[PDB]
Amino acid sequence: KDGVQALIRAVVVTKSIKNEIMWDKITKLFPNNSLDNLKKKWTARRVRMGHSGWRAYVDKWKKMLVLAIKSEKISLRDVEELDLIKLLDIWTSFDEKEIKRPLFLYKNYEENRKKFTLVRDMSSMIQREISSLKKTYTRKISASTKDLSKSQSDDYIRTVIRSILIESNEIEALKNVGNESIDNVIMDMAKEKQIYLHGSKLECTDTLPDILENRGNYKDFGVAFQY
């Protein structure tokens, strides 16, 4: 029973790598009932953490797994073969690196900012009615710093990178951009699955081409114009 964190991590490891909860193989990791108590306890446990807790586990697992592969602490074949023992030992050996108490706040606002550099983070009729009742409509009066120029310039790098990769000895549009920024954008596009990379050739993933091909139905507008 004490291995409940090992069960949560086994669900995260399976559903992140194989896209589904591989219950058949999870059963062979931590000894329990044939599916039932594992499935019941998992289902009961997730509702106590919600989508916010699930994302905390997924984001931490993704971060541990890239650091582990970057430092070669696992061989890629063990990931493909789904060696749950090794994969769970990766989070195990990583969790040994830090410890902390439940957080607290100081009464002065500025003091919290000095102490901590906190990081910010189609269907049936009844499903539409459910979704439409949960939403709140609110007019934003204020928020954190707008940071418009950096955000705009960062998106201008996205525009210029996409404009290269969509079809085709110099680049002009990036000349005025800081050489440090390009690294962040190509990295973000990799995380967001928008690109692939041969030994020195970037390529766009089929998502950018497909979204333009599906949503940009200009051949239909041509027929409508004639009609």
Partner 1 sequence: LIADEFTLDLPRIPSLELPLNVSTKHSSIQKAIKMCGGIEKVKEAFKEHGPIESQHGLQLYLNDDTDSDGSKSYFNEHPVIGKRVPFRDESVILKVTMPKGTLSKNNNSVKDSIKSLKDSNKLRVTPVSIVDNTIKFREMSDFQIKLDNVPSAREFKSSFGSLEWNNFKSFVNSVPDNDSQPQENIGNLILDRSVKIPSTDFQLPPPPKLSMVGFPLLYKYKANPFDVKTASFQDIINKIAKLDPKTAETMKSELKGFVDEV
Partner 2 sequence: MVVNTIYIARHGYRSNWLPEGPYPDPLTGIDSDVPLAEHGVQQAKELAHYLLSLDNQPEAAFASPFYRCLETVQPIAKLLEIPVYLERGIGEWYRPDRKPVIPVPAGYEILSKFFPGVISQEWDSTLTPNEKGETEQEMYMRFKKFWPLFIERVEKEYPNVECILLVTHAASKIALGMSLLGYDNPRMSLNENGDKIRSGSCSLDKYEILKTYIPFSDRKWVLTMNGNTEFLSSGEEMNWNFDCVAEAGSEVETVYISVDIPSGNYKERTEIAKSAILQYSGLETDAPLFRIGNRLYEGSWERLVGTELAFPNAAHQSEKIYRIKERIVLSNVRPM
Partner 3 sequence: NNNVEFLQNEVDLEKRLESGENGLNLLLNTVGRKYRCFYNNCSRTFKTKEKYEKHIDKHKVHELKL
Q: One symbol per residue from 137 to 166: x for binding partner 3 (CB under 8 A), - otherwise; what is it?
A: ------------------------x--xx-
Query: How far out from the chain centre does Cα 138 lie?
Result: 27
Decide if residue 171 touches partner 3 (CB under 8 A): yes
Comparing CA positions, the residue from 16, 20, 23 lying closest to residue 7 is 23
Query: How far out from the chain centre does Cα 7 lie?
Result: 21
Minimum distance from residue 71 beta carbon to partner 1 (Å): 39
Q: Is 116 or 196 the residue whose CB approaches partner 2 more closely?
A: 116
Those residues whose C-beta lies under 8 Å from the C-beta of residue 34, and which sit 6 or more positions away, are: 27
Span between the terminal Cα atoms of the chain, in Å: 69
Decide if residue 197 touches partner 1 (CB under 8 A): no
Distance (Å, whole) CA 194 – CA 206: 8
Minimum distance from residue 54 beta carbon to partner 3 (Å): 17
Amino acid identity at 152? Q
Those residues whose C-beta lies under 8 Å from the C-beta of residue 73, and which sit 6 or more positions away, are: 90, 93
> Contacting partner 3 (CB under 8 A), which of 38, 65, 88, 90?
65
Burial of 202 (0-12, 13-18, 19+ CB in 10 A): middle
Decide if residue 140 touches partner 2 (CB under 8 A): yes
Instruction: Select the binding partner of residue 199 from partner 1, partner 2, partner 3, none (C-beta < 5 to 8 A, by kind).
Output: partner 3
27, 37 in Cβ contact below 8 A? no
Instruction: Select the binding partner of residue 126 from partner 3, partner 1, partner 2, none (C-beta < 5 to 8 A, by kind).
Output: partner 1
Where does residue 119 fall: left (phi above 0), alpha (psi -120 to 50 degrees), or beta otherwise?
beta
Q: Is 16 or 32 the residue whose CB approaches partner 3 more closely?
A: 16
Comparing CA positions, the residue from 186, 220, 184 lying closest to residue 203 is 186
Minimum distance from residue 222 beta carbon to partner 2 (Å): 38
Minimum distance from residue 128 beta carbon to partner 1 (Å): 6
Query: Residue numbers of the site for partner 3 (CB under 8 A)?
Result: 16-19, 65-66, 69-70, 76, 79-80, 161, 164-165, 168-171, 174, 179, 182-183, 186-187, 190-191, 193, 195-197, 199-203
Query: Residue numbers of the site for partner 1 (CB under 8 A)?
Result: 104-108, 125-126, 128-130, 132-134, 141-142
